[PDB]
Design a protein around this nucleic acid. Sequence first.
RNA 1: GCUCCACACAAAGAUGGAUACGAAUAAGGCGUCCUUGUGGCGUCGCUGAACCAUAGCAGGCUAGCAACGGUGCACUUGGCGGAAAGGCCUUGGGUGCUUGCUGGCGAAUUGCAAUGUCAGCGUGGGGAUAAAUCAUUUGUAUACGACUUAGA
RNA 2: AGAACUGGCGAUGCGGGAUGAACCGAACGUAGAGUUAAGGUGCCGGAAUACACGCUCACAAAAGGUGUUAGUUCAUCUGAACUA
Lengths: 137, 197, 106, 69, 170
Amino acid sequence: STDSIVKASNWRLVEVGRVVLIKKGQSAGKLAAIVEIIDQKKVLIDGPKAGVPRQAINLGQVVLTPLTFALPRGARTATVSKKWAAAAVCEKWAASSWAKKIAQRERRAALTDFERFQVMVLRKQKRYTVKKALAKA
Amino acid sequence: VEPVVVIDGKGHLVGRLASVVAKQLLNGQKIVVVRAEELNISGEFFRNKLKYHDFLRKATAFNKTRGPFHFRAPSRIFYKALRGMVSHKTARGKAALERLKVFEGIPPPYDKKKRVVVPQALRVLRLKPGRKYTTLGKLSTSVGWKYEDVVAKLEAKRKVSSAEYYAKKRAFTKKVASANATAAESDVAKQLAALGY
Amino acid sequence: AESHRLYVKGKHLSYQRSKRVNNPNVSLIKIEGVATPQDAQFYLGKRIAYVYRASKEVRGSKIRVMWGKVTRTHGNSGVVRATFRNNLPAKTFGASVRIFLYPSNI
Amino acid sequence: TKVSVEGVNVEKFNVEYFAKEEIKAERVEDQKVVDKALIAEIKKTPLLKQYLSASFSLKNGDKPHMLKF
Amino acid sequence: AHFKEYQVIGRRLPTESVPEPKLFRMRIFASNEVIAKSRYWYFLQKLHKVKKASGEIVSINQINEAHPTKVKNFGVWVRYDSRSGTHNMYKEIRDVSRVAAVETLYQDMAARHRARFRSIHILKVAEIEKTADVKRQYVKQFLTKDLKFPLPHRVQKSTKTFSYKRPSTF
RNA sequence: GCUCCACACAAAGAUGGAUACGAAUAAGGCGUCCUUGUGGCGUCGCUGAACCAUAGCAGGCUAGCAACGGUGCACUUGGCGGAAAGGCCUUGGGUGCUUGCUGGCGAAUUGCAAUGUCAGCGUGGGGAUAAAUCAUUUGUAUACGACUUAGA
RNA sequence: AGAACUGGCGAUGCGGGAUGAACCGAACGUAGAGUUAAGGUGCCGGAAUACACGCUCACAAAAGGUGUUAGUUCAUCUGAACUA
């Protein structure tokens, strides 16, 4: 109890070695990481992994992510690659619930009509089971 | 996209919300604004009070009866700044300004319908923080609208009733939201996960 | 089924106009779900049908229609100019216009 | 969504078969002819029987410029 | 616009029985070629007595970036005239190229000091090769060790006219 | 307002669903821990593109397999809602539905598009009920008006 | 005051200028489709509640600001006077 209550508000922080999800550009939904910081707006992003070319960017175009790793000051392409897989951020990312969502609507987009009909009949059955089982107590 | 949107005023501004509500009227989407007291405006309470009074000193010399009027209940201030943006001379506007229904608070039966907001008129987003603003219900109380104390008394009623419902509902959901977990991992669930859900 | 709608819905807005002179040749249409021109490009050319009632039964049914096409995009937000055969009455600005799906070329 | 037509005859009819001037029992006959073989083909796919029974319609929020058929 | 930076070399015309003059060279920063040659005349009239027709122009180049992904620091000497004659100025600019700095400088000159594109004359731009030669505090503000800040109250732009979310910054 | 006869509508823009805490936004939900905290743990958000609902002649007629569901309608208990409450939940039977599963018969000829469907009611003249008015009287009113009494 | 030249109005519509003899474009047969000038794109109203970096809280001319941002030149360990 004598431990203080001051807390917490832990947010995402610009810093070297932070994977950012680029939301508009030729990337448009990929990952990169922050090599190094220019100023309150402009930064320098890249990863050779997901293909994003290394470039300046104005933070408007790009959303941070919970995920980061460790990385030198002003690293380079090859480096950021080696550290990248070294950190296994792709696994980590895709494991998350977030990336599950992006992948989700991505696929729901691709549903062929007939597929979508499958989805109808199934959800009818599954629904019916949950309703059966529930409301018995 | 609903037949009738029930829009919330809390945390919004006037000018921006006003414009939007307007144009949406001219395209024929019915609207019921609610909780007008809660509305906000740029500028400190001073500046706004001054502009309003400087609108209180505009009258007609021969007689006040058909000259500039003055309105108080925030619904009517909002309504004003909105109706200035519709052409109410023509039959277009007059047919629009009938599609708009403003309230103060949340009168029935709009409590029980889902309220929505307008993300481009919100104060929290628009105004830069650390910069003065004004709440409407205050201003309108200081221009003579008397009923503010009642409004609170009514919301402190609704909000209680509200909180009860929202409780039970959530509680109920815990069943279903947990129940689904047993219907998970089954074949059909495996598929519905493979078919994109 | 419950919902037989085969047609996107929409709103009629204005006639094309200058700031002063309107030009009631070509109605301007708002479409539900199209936010952007490259979404429009799909719709250009479908058949819009404005549908309403007449209390005097004409052909044996009181529901009447004007037809027409959808010609070209309008503005960046995805308004789309349509031209009917007999121009829309201007009684209806902001009334629900139906956009069918055919001619169908994909 | 494809199927197999290959086990079905074709040429038995063309524009003239549909030229015109109730039902002509011949027409019915051809109907059953293609009927059998074709349905028997369809039964090779799950639900694809029903999927030709039910109608099609846009549901709410559907955006035919985003759809893939 | 996007700037491009032109090496420019005048031969300005050799007089009778006089060969091959001194081939003046300048680095102009324009948004396209013709603007450059426009300037190179413009300044070169001033920098000593010549005239547009009297002279000539030879070489033109787009000098690309040296190493475009190296974050680099610069300082810049400006000559710009308002209301009266100029005051030669100096700044530092932290960016990813020469062009990006020059641009940002222009936008700034427009944002406060109020002198337009005719008036501004780049004197010299230089990269700061070591650190600690950086005087301006706002620049070396970012030169610290282990630098971190959050999104200053993230402003999301929703693309509809309705949200049901009561959205949050986060 | 009711009853009778004669005769007229019907026995500013729909087509799945308007889908409900509140409060901050330099922060909050949700689950959970334990003493009950201004607590611990997890986690979520970065769109409603969501969620439910959705098959059947515009949605027929018929066979069962499971399961005691879900759903309609009308009877029906009970309680809540007076900010415009006219809304919501709920209990109990019957009635129909079922697509959770598998059946069988029907559709054309509307001929290759030109929605092609599926939002008791006033008239005018009787009979009757209760009025109100003119008129008459009065005077607190008054130019006319208008107003106030009394007249079973 | 009349001095000169040189335009525009007088005989003249059309787009914009919130409105106008002097302003910005623009030559007037009737129509169809396209593209622009000028001016604009919160709503009234057709068109980006676009993107970007910044500044501020709405003829009087010299000014005052223990305003605000950026610079100029002098000297210590930040100061002074100024410029924008």
